[PDB]
Design a protein around this ligand. Structure first.
Ligand SMILES: [Ca+2]
Ligand SMILES: [Ca+2]
Ligand SMILES: [Ca+2]
Ligand SMILES: [Zn+2]
Length: 257
């Protein structure tokens, strides 16, 4: 929805600024404190209800607030009943993590193997998530060999993808749901990599209030979702749709193959 706001608060506070002080409550983590001084937060990726705070040295602080965790932005100096776990501090700002337990420092190699992380992929409406990153994911050994039909329906791959976006996405790059990221030339792979973000962001950026369609058509129009029996704006073929089915698939047997 828009729960991806806590991450913006942290980025908006310490992103890019060199860390002047880093402190961790967990002893296992104390070893990363001095290593970060001088470094900065490149960005904060969201993953389900977790936060991945990336640093300029390739390290990544994983943290799941669960039931009580709560970040707080203060001023370098401003110092309450809750127990502090993490303290990242810049010249002007300092963000603080209180009450959390699910806290880990991960190396790039440990990202794809982390239990929770391999259950929820980046969110398509996440500004920091770039096409170049989606392509990598598409080509990783974990997905490169999956049919898009289900892959685009699997939240472990990418968060924010519903069946109504799956069909539209596939129709824009002319593909049927039986393709794999491994049966695609460089261009085809990149076309879809941009599709997965553009139509989802396009769809949302322009959503209109309810019942508004009664007097005004949205700027974003579906091309195959709920358009079975109508012609395809592209080639004119009658758009079909599967039954037999998880989520009703939609496509143009004419220009999708
Ligand atoms: Ca489309
Ligand atoms: Ca109006
Ligand atoms: Ca083909
Ligand atoms: Zn067509």
């Amino acid at each position: 929805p828009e729960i991806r706001r806590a991450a913006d608060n942290l980025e908006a506070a310490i992103k890019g600024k060199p860390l002047t002080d880093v402190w961790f409550a967990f002893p296992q983590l104390k070893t990363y404190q001095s290593q970060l001084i001088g470094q900065h937060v490149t960005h904060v990726e969201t993953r389900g209800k977790a936060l991945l705070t990336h640093f300029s040295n390739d390290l990544t602080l994983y943290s799941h607030n669960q039931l009580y965790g709560v970040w707080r932005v203060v001023d370098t100096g401003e110092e309450t009943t809750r127990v502090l776990r993490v303290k990242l501090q810049t010249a002007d700002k300092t963000i603080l993590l209180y009450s959390a337990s699910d806290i880990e420092m991960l190396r790039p190699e440990q990202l794809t193997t982390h239990p929770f992380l391999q259950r929820v992929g980046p969110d398509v409406l996440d500004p920091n998530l770039t096409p170049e990153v989606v392509k990598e994911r598409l080509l990783s050994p974990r997905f490169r060999n999956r049919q898009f039909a289900g892959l685009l329906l699997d939240q472990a791959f990418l968060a924010g993808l519903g069946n109504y976006l799956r069909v539209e996405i596939l129709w824009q790059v002319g593909l049927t749901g039986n393709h794999k990221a491994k049966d695609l030339n460089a261009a085809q792979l990149d076309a879809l990599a941009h599709a997965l973000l553009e139509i989802p962001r396009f769809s949302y950026a322009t959503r209109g209030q309810v019942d508004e369609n009664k007097h005004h058509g949205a700027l974003f129009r579906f091309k195959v979702f709920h358009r079975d029996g109508e012609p395809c704006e592209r080639c004119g073929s009658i758009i079909e749709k599967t039954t037999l089915s998880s989520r009703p698939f939609y496509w143009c047997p004419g220009c999708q193959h």
